């Protein structure tokens, strides 16, 4: 059947941000989790480039 | 009204007597119109060698098939005709033949028992007919997983000892055993000082004695002397025997540590802890609310179809453990929980639960000693294994003495960090590895 | 609402684990002491006076 | 929101020198932060239950 | 017929304290455990150092 | 009975309206936080109540989504608020405490 | 030298209830409440209700929750068991004598204050299936259940086990109704072992005064006849052949009981030839290899079934059944001895005496007697009763079976099992 | 000699709290494990015979 | 089997036949439950070998030609080594079978031995069937002629 569902890697992705059952309910206050994630990679990404010189 | 305590003092004292022979004739009179009489012999399979093995079992098959005075079929005709019941059994250390009969029939009952016990007409035609029968029995016994697992458990626990052997013997012995082989076994074993004439019911001990002298007179009189061995202790090994067979639908597992044996006072406490773990079967009413954590967790998570603790006693040794039946994917969990309970009891038995276990035992004992048969069997066995008959009042006293400290002390001695004897049959892919079963026999917090 | 854990059984349970909890503290004591070479404590121990 | 506001006060204070008004008001916001969490919110909860017949 | 199943002789592998069918393994259980546990005790002590 | 009871009752009716779940068509017991005791009681509800309870909650989640509310007419009037779950929960608590007493002995 | 025994004490309260007690100075106590609530009381709209009931002896009551019933009883190492037959339900309780009060209370609660809560009942339904599966693994049970469904059109045709279509469908209201209309004073008896009459009678007058059910031990079993067949492949064919005989307690019943022992019931000797068994010898003669045969004798409040039961190889069914029948026929035709009726007599009498040797059996005999006869008959008079069976009565019993409309149930590979038509 | 059940023959089921469930009336099987070849399970989707609450010292 | 037995008629007619005959015709169109999973390939081989033979066979063609059929028959359907007659012989017996259910509707069939197909008595039964009444002729009718 469907690859997204059974591939040992995608399963994760799929069950983490694709098929995951979520409340129809959650509002803007729920966006901060993903923004924290974005803040993290951003600090990692720019932070790295800063270390190639600092 | 009469208290429980008082009620124990009311139980008539078992009467003992000895013939100038070695035959101990013991009885317990009651007012019943019925009774049970019999011979308990210190003959088993723990007494046999690798080639005699199956001997006693073979003799039982011949026992009621003809004596010298009562040929081929007459003995039955007599028992049946008076409405009596003739039965027999053999374990690894004991052999019995007993009759259930109307009290007045006590005379003939005994006269018959004696005849069977001494004049066994092992006629070739029959010794031959019995071999196709015993062979058949083995074939059916093979379908009883439970019987197979305890045989396996013995086989490994007692590796290299006679106690390793099964009662019925191996098929090769069943087909090769000679009359000479049987004759020898009887003479070596069925002799006065190793057998007890027991009875329970409406009889007077005098009567019993009269009869013991009347029909059992003339065994070890001009006998005793040379060729009478003692039993050598049996080494317990602590190992595993896994018979893997995915064709069966439920797995049987039997684990045990080495027990002390018959005479050890430690048995009472061991029996109380067992009672706390108890048993379970899928038809038990009350699952989740059961007292035993094993049973309750077992029932709630459907971790098995049944389980039972046990304490099999042999002279100086024994098997102490539990047996269970479960689905292929539950063996691990079941093992974990069972072990968890032993450990818990070893390290932290609470006081309340020990009273339950005690109460369970008093109820089991008293409930078991109900009716002539069980009592006669208790007289006969007790004399063979205690030399005395232990009055309920004393067992109560012994039970009474157990409290929590005793439980966690006595359980620790036998269970804590000891090597189990493990026997597995069925779809046992998930039966834990021995190392891991052994690791579950102690715990790192303690 | 820790009253759920207050009764005879629980009291028996606590006594049963006392020797164990005591011994586990003996292990942690010596454990830190030895691992930091506790000058203060170790001076009392015969043969471990490496000064 | 008192808790939020009280943190905003704490932010403000921490950005000011340890002098005049600021000391004692800074010490007030402190006790408050702890009173609001350790005692006022738990109590309000019990009262709101009581008010619902719960 | 499952009664023909005897456990193979292990004498070839058994510790000397457990060679006799005549005698209890209880007597030497301590010593046998003693031995193997001392081995791990010492190891941990080594790794610790 | 008198002014006194009415005052407490009206203080209660006031909080109720302020709590504001009734605006979402909910009922007091619908807002109860689900724990072990609560899960079991929800489980013991008979078919009808359990069905109604799910639809109520669905109506609300749906509203809380688009952040709308029910017309005033359809709010759930105090008084008219059925504590359907209460008796079940009380019995579930009453059962547990019995095990808990038993566990002390 | 035991003390002289007590006498059983018996009392009929004017409301119908019976009380019986014996003070065996036993260390344990046995209390049982017997009720005419057996499966024959179910009707076509509520089958299996008394099974589910039989299984709910520990659901919550008023004044005792499930958990308490379980923990309370195991705390003293007591037992609570419920046992049924097509006529009675029998709740028995056991424990050491210092604990009868707590066990008596629990008993009263299970039998008189059951709550049957929706969710506890729902949780319990699957147990019917487990319970039935475990029983039906003995071929006899399906057979005897078919035997009865074939023999009667009524009441006694009901089975001890819930029909499969009813598993999961019995309702708490049906349980309430079954108890209300069957667990009443006039259909009840309270038997005590190790307790005292005044305590029993006190308990009875305080808690067992309930009346508002129905009356007689009958809808009335209509005997019908006909047979039921279940193809199987079990290697062994199981079969039972029966006719209407006599109601329990009537004098004809003891004739059947004796006939049963002439023909032959269970074995008396471990692995014997069964020399004194007319049936086993008669089949032996014409059949050489695996088989068992036994006379069968069920007796109820208003009817009874008598015949025999055979287990044989799929190909020997016909021969085993035919020979077995012919042997009864022989006794019906008058070819019965005197030392035979005597031996049978001695097997019956001794068997009875042995049957009430333990407490479990004494209490059950006493309980059932109380329920079927409203009295207690001592062993000496039962022996006298058997003793009054005459050779011709036994011959007549045999005669009645031969000429009466038959009932057969059989399961296995039936390819060689006769139809009735062909007997 | 009432007690239809133990008058050997018809069926009697027993449910229990501590002990195992029973089915046990009268018919053959007894003089059948003798003229052998009578298997039976070894605990197939099952229970357990002889049952418990019978011990010793 | 589950799909067929969901029409009450099927269990009924299967019981009808098991009750009416002691033989052959008593067999059901569907496998007994105890046999599900137990029929063997050797049994299938045997069933075909002893029943699928020339003397127990007929080859019907629609839209084909006689010579092609007959050619096919003579080339591939010349197999003989089964049994012979259309009978073990159905012994009629009688008696009845009952299945308790709870279906709101009770389904029942009452029958007696009548006539073998093709015999003249069979057409009498066939006509009797229409006098008494078989299926409906009009969508939602009173069934006046029944």
Name the helix and strand elements of chain G from N-terminus to C-terminus, one letter apiece. EEEHHEEHHHHHEHEEHHEEHHHHHE
* Cα gyration radius of chain C (Å): 18 Å
What oligomeric state do these chains adopt?
part of a larger assembly
- Number-wise, the strands of chain G total 11
DSSP strand content of chain C: under 5%
What is the second-level CATH architecture of chain C? Up-down Bundle
CATH architecture group name of the largest domain in chain G: 2-Layer Sandwich
Name the pair of protein chains with the most residues at their interface, and give those residue counts. Answer: B-G, 60 and 61 residues
The CATH superfamily of the largest domain in chain G is identified as Metalloenzyme, LuxS/M16 peptidase-like
Protein name (chain H): Cytochrome b-c1 complex subunit 9
Organism (chain H): Bos taurus
Subcellular location (chain I): Mitochondrion inner membrane
Protein name (chain I): Cytochrome b-c1 complex subunit 2, mitochondrial
Defining key terms:
part of a larger assembly, 9 chains, E: 49 residues, Single alpha-helices involved in coiled-coils or other helix-helix interfaces, elongated, H: 57 residues, little secondary structure, Cytochrome Bc1 Complex, Chain I, extended, transport (chain F), Cytochrome b-c1 complex subunit 7 (chain F), membrane (chain F), QCR7 (chain F), electron transport (chain F)
Verbal overview:
The structure is cut from a larger assembly and holds nine protein chains of seven kinds. Chain C has 51 residues and is mostly helical. Chain C has a single domain, classed as Single alpha-helices involved in coiled-coils or other helix-helix interfaces (Up-down Bundle). Chain C has three helices and no strands. Chain C starts with 7 loop residues before the first helix and ends in a 9-residue tail after the last helix. The radius of gyration of chain E is 17 Å and the shape is elongated. Chain E has 49 residues and is mainly α. The longest helix of chain E has 23 residues, at 26-48. Chain E is 47% helix and 0% strand. By secondary structure, chain G is of the alpha+beta class. Chain G is built from 15 helices and eleven strands. Chain G has helices at 49-54, 66-75, 100-112, 118-124, 126-135, 139-151, 172-182, 197-207, 251-263, 278-286, 317-332, 339-355, 359-373, 379-387, 391-403, and strands spanning 9-12, 18-22, 28-35, 79-84, 89-96, 188-193, 226-231, 236-244, 291-300, 303-313, 406-412. Chain G starts with 8 loop residues before the first strand and ends in an 11-residue tail after the last strand. Chain H is mostly loops and 57 residues long. Chain H is extended, with a radius of gyration of 14 Å. Chain H: This is Cytochrome b-c1 complex subunit 9.
Short note summarizing the structure:
The structure is cut from a larger assembly and holds nine protein chains of seven kinds. By secondary structure, chain A is an all-alpha fold.
